[PDB]
């Protein structure tokens, strides 16, 4: 059950399949051939041809075109939208209009220009708040940008002019000031198109169980092609031949479309199962791979963080009393809107509780975060209570002649090596102490990974964050390994590492840097805290936003393979038993003494085929409730799970065509159509 | 007779297990490259002389040795049958073959099958009979065992890349198994009165006024070769019912033991090399169940026999038209299943003149793929492709991965077994399709009605499945049949051996693993009921319309 806006939007994709692009589905393409040239006979039959009964061969043609239109309806619902690759990540580049300066000096004539004309070596201006239109280097100015597109961090990073730290990247967002940059590379070679074209066209690998019964899709038809299409040289010698309208239809009845529709029938079944675990899935392939994943990858930022990157126990200091120090921490966080300032306000209500200070009753000039000094601050007293990083204030400490003690750097020797992001607060020119902001993890996280390793699954944590930050959290998450400070191209080369080994990989991340690693992954799990680009690139989306909840995904995927093998024993013994239902009834035109093989008292060779195609049409339909309403599993051994599967569904596979043909042949008799 | 029918099979299987038990112990030395305890350095005299350095071979190098042997093994024989007149020991002055009949038999003798579409004592001349046939069945039998040895070695080895040495295999198999065991049987035939000499054709002054010329020749030496190596091409045209080849009923029961002397002992050698004996003792078990059923049908289908005989005023309805009174009715019934389940090609009773049910079952057991105690080599790897299918669908219908004899089996190791099993029922619905369209193949029939369709179908089903059993009412001396079968016998053999060496190539670099929840116990008759329900199934899916237009239409009419 799905909303009809999702459903009706897929039938347009169905009717576009019907030209020569269904040749990759090998069973249903042969069904398309017979359905094509049963209409070629029947239209020529009504115009002029040797056979006479056109209403017979019309209903021969009819249900087959129902079947192809159904089996592609089932598959396009089940397959996807699995390579709905890059829209929102692409749509930024189409909306990448940018102002540019007509002269290289700052204070030039400006004009907003769309991204087409921004060729290599163009004087372009980036004011604050906007994004970066193209790659290159900064030639004039100094500002702080956020590089969440290329690193996946919400931490602002410096970006100056005239230095090593000037190589801007097109796609990231600027925060503080203006920058005059110039495009160093051609269009199409920009990092967005280095990422768009790497996400799009990145091909999923089929699971080996999916590959397996596609051979028995073909290893039965090559049998059934020969045993039908050689009757006409085997009967024409023996008196009368068998007509083409039979033999084309006799070819198509026997073809195992029951196992043809099984790929979608396990697809939409687990698709209905994942919604119960608060997980939107978009691929039927992605459900079944969850019962096979041995290595699953994580981003520590966004998923293991909560977008916070912020904490402290309290503020360490070197011989400075914490009271006016931590009150200045409140003062160094009044004007700020980012949660990094807001957690310090939450730190202010931890111990000293002197919160009762209004914004404008203190009457202070709110110093914003600069880029020359690279610090924010506030001026309530005569002193300048400035907040900033370590090394930016090390300019300001030497700017006023004094020297801070090395134990403040020994705090950094503890803060960074705990895996925290340090902050220093200075009243006037006097250093107070070091504020340490570390990551916090979501919930009962180690107890999930303890279960997750004991389900025989490795755990590797990947980021572009620092090693010394990630190594502590890797100890605080129970993960196996960790690779830090990694480009998004290195994530694919890690997935191509583990998919060289023949192993199925489950990426889980948030950022657009993870959108490459969400492409070639198998169970690609997005996050609702993540961007709308990674949700598009992700093959599967959580609704409750917990990256550790692949455990519920595996316990559903392992239910699916237990139900997948049950549906095979039905369907692999359905179409074998279908073969005994139709072949002896298709002989009475050739030898009249072969009437004794009409076991099920069928009316004519023409009668059994009409019941067969309608049986071959209901059975692709009825798999989806047989995958859902009526569903079974129970954990067993290797042996008796087959023994339990042959009694229930295997013995059921024999009866259903012998039951179903005897039913439909009587409805073609009691109503008596032909 | 029902007790005599029960005793005939039960005597036959019991003595078969006693004889094949130490022979399976013998061949297990040859699989492990362990020389036989009789001759060890005596071999090493010969491999110095031949330059066969005992160097290990991967499958690409191994397969081009056997195929290089068989093509070279044909090029001598294709030159002998042309220039037969220029060769010694000809008692008559018999000319060489026409080039179509040259080509057909030159394929036929290399290819373990021996489709004779002629009469040997009228046409062959004791030297292409001797040095073109008896030297060739000893190759084609060993060419089969060289394959199945490279298959068993692909299972018991762990992460290697080699499959023994090809030329060391063939010399051990011929000169220590195929030659001396056939030597003991060939002496046994003469004790009961077979024929083995180099005399010219002795005439007979009969007791009536007429005369008859008798044929002679080195027959009893040849006769023990083909029955051991499942080769079937006898000297005469009555190529096992002729008295010079099978003079007593006691020579029959040794011949029936000879057809399963090798391809049962290979199953015992299969269980011994792979550690657990039960892997063979199910594989043996899964062929007898098809065997014991398919004999007892034919024994019942001959006790019924023709009802028209007793209608015309005879004694009973027991069919003795296409049989031999020297042998039994049940004994002609047993042999006809034996000689057609086992890819042999010998004939004690002209299969064209059975009943309709009695002709369907030998036509059935070829079309199955020649698995049910099949040909020397070609039965057992013909089985092991179906074993790699019934394991494959089992893991496909549990959910987990297929794993047989400890090794995982991947997609590349499964596309090939889907290919090779789709060859021998591809050609018999292409060869039989090609003959029944044209006026060349339809002209060579003998009988009208649906049974005459079987005479076309039984020929190609004894061509792509490499049997050599003939209805022989089919006058197959035309150049159409002689080019049809020679294409159907070449592809139906070397389109199986080549994907086996690709299967046996790929299982070597893998490594066995531990037991799990995906590893089925591939022994035990709770799995044999999956194998026989697959081995009979692929033959059922491909031939029920091919057979209901044949002898079943004869049976009802």
């Amino acid at each position: 059950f799905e909303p009809t806006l999702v459903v009706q939007a897929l039938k347009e994709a169905v009717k576009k399949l019907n030209p020569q692009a269904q040749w990759r589905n090998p069973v249903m393409f042969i069904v398309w051939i017979g359905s094509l040239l049963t209409t070629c006979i029947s239209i020529a039959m009504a115009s002029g041809a040797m056979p006479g009964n056109a209403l017979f061969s019309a209903a021969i043609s009819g249900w087959l075109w129902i079947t192809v239109l159904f089996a592609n309806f089932a598959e396009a619902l089940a397959e996807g939208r699995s390579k709905a690759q890059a829209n929102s990540l692409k749509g930024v580049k189409k909306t990448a209009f940018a102002r540019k300066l007509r002269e290289p000096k700052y204070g030039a004539a400006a004009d907003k220009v769309p991204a087409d004309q921004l060729r290599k070596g163009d004087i372009v201006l980036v004011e604050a708040g906007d994004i970066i239109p193209c790659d290159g280097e900064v030639i004039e100015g100094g500002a702080s940008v956020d590089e969440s597109a290329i690193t996946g961090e919400s931490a602002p990073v410096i970006r100056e002019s005239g230095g090593d730290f000037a190589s801007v990247t097109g796609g990231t967002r600027i925060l503080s000031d203006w920058l005059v940059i110039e495009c160093s590379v051609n269009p199409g070679e920009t990092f967005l198109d280095r990422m768009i074209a790497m996400v799009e066209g990145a091909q999923r690998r089929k699971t080996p169980n999916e590959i397996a019964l596609t051979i028995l899709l073909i290893a039965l038809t090559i049998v059934f092609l020969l045993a039908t299409a050689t009757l006409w040289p085997f009967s024409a010698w023996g008196g009368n031949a068998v007509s083409v309208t039979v033999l084309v239809a006799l070819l198509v009845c026997l073809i195992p479309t029951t196992i043809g529709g099984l790929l979608s029938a396990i697809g939409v079944a687990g698709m209905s199962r994942m919604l119960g675990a608060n997980v939107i899935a978009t691929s039927g392939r992605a459900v079944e791979a969850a019962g096979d994943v041995d290595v699953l990858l994580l981003d520590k930022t966004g998923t293991i963080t909560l977008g916070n990157r912020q904490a402290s126990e309290f503020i360490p200091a070197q011989g400075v009393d914490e009271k006016t120090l931590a009150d200045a921490a409140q003062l160094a966080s009044l004007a700020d809107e980012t949660p990094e300032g807001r957690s310090i306000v939450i730190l202010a209500k931890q111990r000293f509780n002197l919160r009762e200070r209004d914004v404008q009753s203190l009457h202070a000039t709110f110093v914003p975060f600069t880029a020359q000094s690279r610090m924010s601050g506030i001026n309530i007293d005569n002193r300048m209570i400035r907040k900033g990083s370590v090394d930016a204030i090390r300019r300001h400490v030497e700017a006023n002649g004094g020297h801070f003690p090395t134990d403040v750097d020994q705090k950094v020797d503890q803060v960074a090596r705990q895996g925290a992001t340090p902050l220093v607060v200075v009243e006037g020119s006097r250093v107070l102490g070091v504020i340490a902001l570390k990551d916090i993890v979501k919930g009962g996280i180690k107890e999930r990974f303890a279960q997750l390793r004991k389900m025989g699954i490795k755990t590797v944590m990947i980021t572009g964050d620092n090693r010394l930050t990630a190594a502590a959290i890797a100890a605080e998450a129970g993960v196996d390994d960790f690779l830090a400070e990694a480009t998004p191209e290195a994530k694919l080369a890690l997935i191509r590492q583990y998919q060289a080994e023949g192993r199925l990989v489950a990426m889980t991340g948030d950022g657009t840097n993870d959108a490459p690693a969400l492409a070639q992954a198998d169970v690609a799990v997005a996050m609702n805290s993540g961007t709308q680009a990674a949700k598009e690139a992700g093959n599967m989306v959580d609704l409750d936003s917990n990256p550790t909840k692949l455990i519920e995904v595996v316990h559903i995927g392992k239910q699916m393979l237990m139900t997948r093998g049950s549906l095979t024993t039905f369907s692999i013994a359905n179409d074998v038993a279908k073969y005994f239902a139709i072949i002896p009834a298709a002989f009475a035109a050739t030898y009249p003494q072969l009437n004794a093989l009409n076991i099920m008292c069928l009316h004519s060779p023409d009668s059994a085929i009409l019941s067969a195609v309608i049986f071959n049409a209901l059975i692709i339909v009825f798999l989806i409730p047989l995958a859902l309403k009526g569903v079974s599993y129970k954990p067993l051994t290797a042996s008796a799970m087959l023994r339990r599967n042959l009694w229930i569904y295997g013995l059921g596979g024999l009866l259903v065509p012998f039951i179903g043909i005897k039913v439909i042949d009587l409805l073609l008799t009691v109503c008596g159509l032909v | 007779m029902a007790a005599q029918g029960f005793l005939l099979i039960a005597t036959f299987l019991l003595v078969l297990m006693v004889l094949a038990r130490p022979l399976g112990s013998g061949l297990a030395r040859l699989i492990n490259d362990i020389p036989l305890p009789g001759t060890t350095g005596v071999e090493r005299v010969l491999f110095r002389a031949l330059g066969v350095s005992d160097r290990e071979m991967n499958w690409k190098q191994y397969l081009c040795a056997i195929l290089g042997l068989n093509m070279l093994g044909l090029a001598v024989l294709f030159f002998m049958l042309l220039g037969q007149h220029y060769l010694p020991l000809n008692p008559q002055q018999l000319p060489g073959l026409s080039w179509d009949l040259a080509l057909n038999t030159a394929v036929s003798f290399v290819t373990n099958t021996n489709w004779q579409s002629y009469s040997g004592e009228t046409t062959l001349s004791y030297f292409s009979q001797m040095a073109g046939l008896t030297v060739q069945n000893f190759l084609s039998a060993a060419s089969g065992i060289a394959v199945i040895f490279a298959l068993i070695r692909a299972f018991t080895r762990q992460s290697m890349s080699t499959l023994g040495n090809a030329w060391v295999d063939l010399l051990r198999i011929t000169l220590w198994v195929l030659v001396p065991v056939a030597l003991l049987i060939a002496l046994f035939f003469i004790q009961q009165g077979a024929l083995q000499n180099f005399l010219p054709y002795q005439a007979v002054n009969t007791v009536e006024g007429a005369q008859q010329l008798l044929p002679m020749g080195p027959v009893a030496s040849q006769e023990a070769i083909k029955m051991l190596g499942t080769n079937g091409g006898g000297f005469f045209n009555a190529n096992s019912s002729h008295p010079f080849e099978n003079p007593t009923a006691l020579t029959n029961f040794v011949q029936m033991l000879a057809i399963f002397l090798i391809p049962t002992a290979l199953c015992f050698a299969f269980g011994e090399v792979m550690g657990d004996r039960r892997q063979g003792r199910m594989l043996l078990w899964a062929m007898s169940v098809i065997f014991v059923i398919c004999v007892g049908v034919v024994m019942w289908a001959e006790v019924q026999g023709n009802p028209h005989l007793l209608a015309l005023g005879t004694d009973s309805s027991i069919n003795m038209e296409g049989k031999e009174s020297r042998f039994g009715v049940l004994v002609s019934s047993l042999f006809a299943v034996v000689t057609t389940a086992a890819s042999c090609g010998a004939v004690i009773a002209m299969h064209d003149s059975f009943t309709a049910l009695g002709g369907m079952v030998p036509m059935w057991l070829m079309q199955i793929g020649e698995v049910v105690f099949g040909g020397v080599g070609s039965g057992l790897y013909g089985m092991m492709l179906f074993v790699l299918l019934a394991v494959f669908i089992a893991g496909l219908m549990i959910g987990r991965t297929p794993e047989y004899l400890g090794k995982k089996i991947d997609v590349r190791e499964m596309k090939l077994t889907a290919l090779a099993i789709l060859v021998t029922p591809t050609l018999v619905l292409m060869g039989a399709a090609l003959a029944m369209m044209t006026d060349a193949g339809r002209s060579a029939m003998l009988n009208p009605g649906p049974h005459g369709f079987s005479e076309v179908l039984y020929a190609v089903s004894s061509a792509a499945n490499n049997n050599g059993s003939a209805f022989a009412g089919l006058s197959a001396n035309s150049p159409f049949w002689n080019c049809l079968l020679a294409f159907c016998m070449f592809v139906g053999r070397f389109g199986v051996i080549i994907p086996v060496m690709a299967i046996a190539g790929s299982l070597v670099s893998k490594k066995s693993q531990a037991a799990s929840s995906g590893t089925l116990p591939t022994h035990g008759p709770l799995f044999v009921g999956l194998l026989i329900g697959t081995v009979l199934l692929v033959g059922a899916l491909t031939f029920i319309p091919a057979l209901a237009l044949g002898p079943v239409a004869e049976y009802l009419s």
Partner: peptide, 27 residues
């Protein structure tokens, strides 16, 4: 020997030319 005779044979050869090509590959 007609288009209602031999052109059906060419079609069935093409399906084996298709199905086997579908069986060689995991397309």
């Amino acid at each position: 020997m007609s288009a209602g005779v031999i052109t059906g044979v060419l079609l069935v050869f093409l399906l084996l030319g298709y199905l086997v090509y579908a069986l060689i590959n995991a397309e």
